[PDB]
Design a protein around this ligand. Structure first.
Ligand SMILES: CCCCCCCCCCCCCCCCCC(=O)OC[C@H](COP(=O)([O-])OCC[N+](C)(C)C)OC(=O)CCCCCCCCCCCCCCCCC
Ligand SMILES: CCCCCCCCCCCCCCCCCC(=O)OC[C@H](COP(=O)(O)OCCN)OC(=O)CCCCCCCCCCCCCCCCC
Ligand SMILES: CCCCCCCCCCCCCCCCCC(=O)OC[C@H](COP(=O)(O)OCCN)OC(=O)CCCCCCCCCCCCCCCCC
Lengths: 459, 57
């Protein structure tokens, strides 16, 4: 794991020592090489998990998240290159440093084998996202968005810290593999119910429920493109990863203690898809779509079926890729027009043909299309939920119908129709942003071609 | 035939001889309970380092 962490650590001296005319080139190229290096722990021949160190470990669950983070860092650099062109060199290098530190801390978080170290790196990732959102956001409400994001996360995470220290004082180790082996059943008391709530609510805040979710649209609207990318593609999945990790020591009482959150997830995915239907902001629409998909992930992890876990992992990776792609496309239009109003730019398929192709493919990934890991994850989540109770299929069907409706509504209202001819400042395309869309979409095709990698722990 | 003592003669120690036995336990002292069993041995290093959470060393 150190062979991946240390080059990413040395990215920062490269960033601060590179010439100002070569900084973006050097950091982007070496971060691509670091992702290529991070591809090496897919070499999983045996069923044994790759335990490199006494503190670092690999997993069929942790590996796709690490590879996605290492892949997404150069994509964030490419996306954030254009909107920092009229900026001080020190500020540009500081922004690149924030992105690189996010990548380092997230790789360490996913590869950490101890829950307390996972918590430390969890809040360590909480810091530079706040700095990015507040310092480089565009509108006034970035400060409110940062406050909401930070303190939703912290009020979630403090009972998680209390619960982790309780578990460490009880069993003596707080190591994931020792807990997984000598896990102990809980005697179903009110203290154990509160312990379950304390160790769940941090991750239930971090990936959005129907309740606490109000920080996500604010942060996504007010964040720059790299911040939206890192949030919607890694941090919600970080909450899901934490839930999958910590659910193993709560064996007997999850089967009744998970009831309110399953209902909250299903009805909330319906309501957030409805908001996507009647939403006037493109980034808000993508954010609420992310809430709906993560609600599906919450329901699968709560019902704790092998099909549910596999579908949860597939939906995690697929949703990260397609949400980053949608955010990048919306950011390209926003860099053209300097407004996120959805109804204002309408006939963009006329002037941007292949960007419209990327829009069409991104929306076909957003809805569940059967040659895609999106439909793979959503379909196996549906199968596990219907096994859990047959009446969940009604909520699933309503969610799928509204999902198709808001995705095709997005395509029709922002690409098709008569072109708003008054918008003179529609530059043709940047090879950079077309490359950005291609680097989002081609991994979706490859993971569709071989979905055994995205299958998680259970099979 | 008595001689009055000098200026500094009555104010010194005398070393009087007696046959009364010396009291072996003045103050009627109690058992004086034994101290703690001090641990002896070679100072080996701490096992597996500090054992503070995830710190290996
Ligand atoms: C962001 C989400 C916030 C809301 C949900 C938070 C969790 C709600 C349910 C848990 C109770 C509150 C958090 C306790 C954290 C520690 C849990 C734990 O270790 O439980 C086992 C312990 C019990 O320890 P034990 O299990 O060792 O008990 C001994 C048991 N025998 C003898 C059988 C071995 O629970 C507690 O000690 C709970 C005491 C809580 C006192 C403080 C309450 C503060 C107010 C509550 C809400 C706080 C968050 C919201 C603040 C406002 C936000 C707007
Ligand atoms: C793992 C975590 C990932 C997280 C995100 C990572 C992003 C960065 C990725 C960096 C590169 C990693 C690539 C990972 C995928 C690799 C794909 C691959 O080569 O898979 C192997 C597969 C053959 O292997 P095999 O063992 O036969 O497959 C299982 C069979 N039991 O090979 C093949 O089958 C050949 C594949 C290449 C040849 C071209 C395929 C063209 C497919 C066209 C599809 C058209 C339809 C698309 C519809 C889309 C709709 C939305
Ligand atoms: C938002 C919607 C919240 C309400 C949803 C509908 C009610 C759900 C009630 C529930 O969770 O019932 C499960 C369980 C049933 O009772 P039982 O299994 O016997 O457990 C005895 C507890 N000592 O009851 C219990 O375990 C009682 C405690 C339930 C606590 C639920 C979580 C806290 C509230 C989150 C909001």
């Amino acid at each position: 794991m150190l062979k991946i962490i240390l080059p990413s650590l040395m990215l920062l001296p490269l960033t601060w020592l590179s010439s100002p005319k070569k900084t973006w080139t050097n950091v982007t190229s070496y971060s691509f090489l670091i992702s290529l290096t991070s591809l090496t722990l897919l070499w999983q021949t045996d069923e044994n998990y790759k335990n490199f160190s006494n503190m670092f470990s690999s997993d069929p669950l942790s590996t796709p998240l690490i590879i996605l983070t290492a892949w997404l860092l150069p994509l964030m650099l490419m996306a954030s290159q254009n909107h920092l062109k009229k900026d001080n060199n020190v500020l540009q290098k500081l922004y690149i440093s924030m992105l690189i530190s996010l990548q380092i801390l997230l790789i360490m978080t996913f590869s950490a084998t101890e829950l307390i170290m996972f918590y430390i790196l969890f809040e360590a990732t909480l810091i530079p996202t706040l700095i990015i959102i507040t310092r480089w956001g565009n509108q006034t409400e970035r400060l409110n968005a940062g406050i909401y994001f930070l303190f939703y996360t912290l009020i979630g995470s403090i009972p998680l810290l209390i619960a982790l220290i309780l578990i460490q004082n009880h069993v003596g180790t707080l190591n994931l593999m020792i807990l997984s082996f000598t896990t102990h059943t809980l005697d179903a008391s009110w203290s154990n119910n509160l312990l379950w709530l304390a160790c769940m609510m941090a991750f239930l805040i971090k990936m959005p429920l129907y309740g606490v979710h109000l920080w996500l649209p604010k942060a996504h609207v007010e964040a720059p493109i790299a911040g939206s990318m890192i949030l919607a593609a890694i941090l919600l999945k970080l909450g899901s990863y934490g839930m999958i990790r910590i659910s193993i020591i709560l064996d007997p009482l999850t089967k009744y203690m998970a009831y309110p959150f399953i209902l909250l997830s299903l009805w909330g995915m319906i309501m957030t898809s409805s908001i996507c239907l009647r939403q006037t902001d493109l980034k808000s629409l993508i954010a609420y779509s992310s809430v709906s998909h993560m609600a599906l992930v919450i329901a699968s992890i709560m019902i704790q079926t092998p099909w549910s876990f596999m579908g949860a992992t597939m939906l995690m990776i697929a949703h990260g890729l397609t949400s980053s792609l949608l955010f990048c496309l919306a950011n390209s239009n926003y860099e053209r027009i300097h407004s996120r109003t959805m109804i204002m730019a309408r006939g963009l398929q006329m002037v941007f043909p292949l960007m419209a192709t990327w829009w069409l493919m991104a929306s076909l990934a957003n809805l569940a299309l059967p040659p895609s890991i999106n439909l793979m994850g959503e379909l196996f989540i549906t199968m596990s939920l219907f096994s859990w109770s047959n009446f969940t299929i009604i909520l699933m069907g309503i969610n799928i119908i509204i999902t198709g409706m808001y995705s095709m509504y997005m395509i029709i209202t922002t690409q098709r129709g008569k072109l708003t001819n008054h918008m003179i400042n529609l530059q043709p395309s940047h090879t950079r942003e077309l490359t950005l869309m291609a680097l989002h979409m081609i991994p979706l095709i490859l993971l569709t071609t071989s979905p055994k990698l995205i299958t998680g722990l259970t099979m | 035939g008595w001689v009055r003592p000098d200026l500094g003669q009555l104010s010194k120690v005398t070393k009087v001889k007696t046959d009364r036995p010396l009291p072996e336990n003045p103050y009627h002292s109690r058992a004086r309970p034994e101290p703690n069993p001090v641990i002896e041995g070679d100072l080996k290093p701490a096992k597996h380092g500090t054992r503070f959470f995830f710190w290996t060393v």
